[PDB]
Amino acid sequence: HETSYGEVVDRYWLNQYVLNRETYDYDTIQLNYDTTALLSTAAVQQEFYKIYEGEDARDKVLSNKARITVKVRSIQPNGRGQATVRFTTQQHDSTGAVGVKQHQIATIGYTYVGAPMKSSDRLLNPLGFQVTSYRTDPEILLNN
Amino acid sequence: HETSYGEVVDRYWLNQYVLNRETYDYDTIQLNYDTTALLSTAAVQQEFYKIYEGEDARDKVLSNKARITVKVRSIQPNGRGQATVRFTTQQHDSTGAVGVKQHQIATIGYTYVGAPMKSSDRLLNPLGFQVTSYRTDPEILLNN
């Protein structure tokens, strides 16, 4: 139960993680941010929080004047606690300007630590899913 | 695996159901509505959809001019496929008018039907959680 809960359950949590972390939408940002934090180890929390700190904090810069919309294309767990997630992001400014679609890959380390101590956390993270490492990179696209 | 996945997992799904079904928030209604539909049997879907149909359709009436905020207080599964959920609702109009807090009980029948056929559904409902019956009633409050 620590390493994996099988492909379907691991994909559920990985999907929830990528969607909540990579989406930028003022309408849902409280939920997206809190979900991402809940599902991250302390070290990954600190990495994520920096996106929302400082002069370039994403919420300060985008405000309610742009959305970053995320489409997950595939999720491949290796069954050993790592996964890759292929996803696209695209920024839509409230003015109607649309950015170029970005093809990305998240490389994710994860584990399940057991039911959280606090009832409130346990209600939203029953198995103690925790992302232990997270990075994103451009996808390789070999055109023919 | 059909009747229950244990208290912690059943509470996760029951909580998600009540929050998504009973919350009214224009900012999250697409997600709330779709989640509720996904997690309901066809018969329960038809009951839920009626809230959003006709002249008194809740989205038509409240628009983006009010929110109904939900606080779940307790969730008691019986381990046999039924649960009660104690929750409060309170309407906040965008003007600042606030309604009286409503103390409610949801009586819920549920089951798990297995991984959905469609990949898209399976990513959001990995175990095939399905609400098979759902009603809400005022909570009994015996004051002393």
Which features does this protein show?
homodimer, 144 residues, alpha+beta, Nuclear Transport Factor 2, Chain: A, 4 strands, 31% helix, transmembrane helix (chains A, B), transmembrane (chains A, B), Type IV secretion system protein virB8 (chains A, B)
Strand order of the largest sheet of chain A: 1-2-3-4
Shape of chain A: globular
Strand fraction of chain A equals 25-35%
| Oligomeric description of these chains | homodimer
* H and E order of chain A: HHHHEEEHE
- Biggest interface: A-B, 16 and 16 residues
What's the β-strand tally of chain A?
4
CATH structural fold name of chain A: Nuclear Transport Factor 2, Chain: A
The first-to-last residue Cα distance of chain A is 43 Å
Helical segment tally of chain A?
5
Estimated radius of gyration of chain A: 16 Å
| CATH architectural group of chain A | Roll
Number of domains of chain A: 1
The CATH fourth-level homologous superfamily of chain A: VirB8 protein
- Give helix % range of chain A: 25-40%
* Main pleated sheet of chain A: 4 strands, antiparallel
Structural class of chain A: alpha+beta
CATH C-level of chain A: Alpha Beta
GO cellular component, one term (chains A, B): endomembrane system
Subcellular location (chains A, B): Endomembrane system
Family (chains A, B): Belongs to the virB8 family.
Protein name (chains A, B): Type IV secretion system protein virB8
Q: Would you give an account of this structure?
A:
2 copies of one chain form a homodimer. Chain A has 144 residues and is an alpha+beta fold. Chain A has a single domain (1-144), classed as Nuclear Transport Factor 2, Chain: A, CATH 3.10.450.230. Helices cover 31% and strands 31% of the residues of chain A. Chain A is built from 5 helices and 4 strands; from the N terminus they run ααααβββαβ. Chain A has helices at 7-22, 29-38, 42-49, 58-62, 119-124, and strands spanning 66-77, 82-93, 102-112, 129-138. The first copy, chain A, has a 4-stranded antiparallel sheet, with helices on one face. In chain A, strand 2 (82-93) and strand 3 (102-112) form a beta hairpin. In chain A, helix 1 (7-22) packs across helix 2 (29-38). The longest helix of chain A is centred in the first third of the chain and has 16 residues, at 7-22. Chain A is globular, with a radius of gyration of 16 Å. At the A-B interface, helix 1 and helix 5 of A face helix 1 and helix 5 of B. It is classed as protein transport. The entry lists the keywords Structural Genomics, niaid, National Institute of Allergy and Infectious Diseases, Seattle Structural Genomics Center for Infectious Disease, ssgcid, cat scratch fever, secretion, host specific adhesion, protein transport. The assembly is dimeric.
